[PDB]
C-alpha cells in the first residue's frame, strides 16, 4: 500500500498527523476517522499536537485500524449535510 502522492508516486514521509509530499511541496494532513462514525471523533490535544479518538463519545479503536484519511478539502461552507 505505502503512502505516495497521487501525482508523483515516489514516497511520502509521515511525521504524525501530516505526511509530507517531497516534490510538489505539499503537506497532506490525515484525520483519524471511524468506519461507522465518520467524524473527527474527538479532538485529543497534547502540547498542541492533536489526535482524533472517540473515547466515550463513541468507542476507542486500535490506531492500527483507524481510518486516517487525507482531508485537506474545504468542508466548512459547501460540503453540506
**Which positions touch Zn ion (CB under 5 A)?**
5, 8, 21-24, 34, 54, 58-59
Bridge partners of 68? 32
Helix (H, G, I), strand (E, B) or coil at 6: coil
**CB-closest chain residue to Zn ion:** 23
- Judged by beta carbon, residue 45 or residue 80, the one nearer Zn ion is 45
Dihedral sign from CA coordinates of 81, 30, 6, 27: positive
Closest separation in Å from C-beta 2 to Zn ion? 13
- Judged by beta carbon, residue 59 or residue 75, the one nearer Zn ion is 59
Amino acid at each position: 500500500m505505502e503512502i505516495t502522492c497521487p501525482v508523483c508516486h515516489h514516497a511520502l514521509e509521515r511525521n504524525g498527523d501530516t505526511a509530507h509530499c517531497e516534490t510538489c511541496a505539499k503537506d497532506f494532513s490525515l484525520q483519524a476517522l471511524c468506519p461507522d462514525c465518520r467524524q473527527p471523533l474527538q479532538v485529543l490535544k497534547a502540547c498542541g499536537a492533536v489526535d482524533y479518538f472517540c473515547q466515550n463519545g463513541h468507542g476507542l479503536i486500535s490506531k492500527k485500524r483507524v481510518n486516517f484519511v487525507i482531508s485537506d478539502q474545504l468542508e466548512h461552507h459547501h460540503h453540506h449535510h
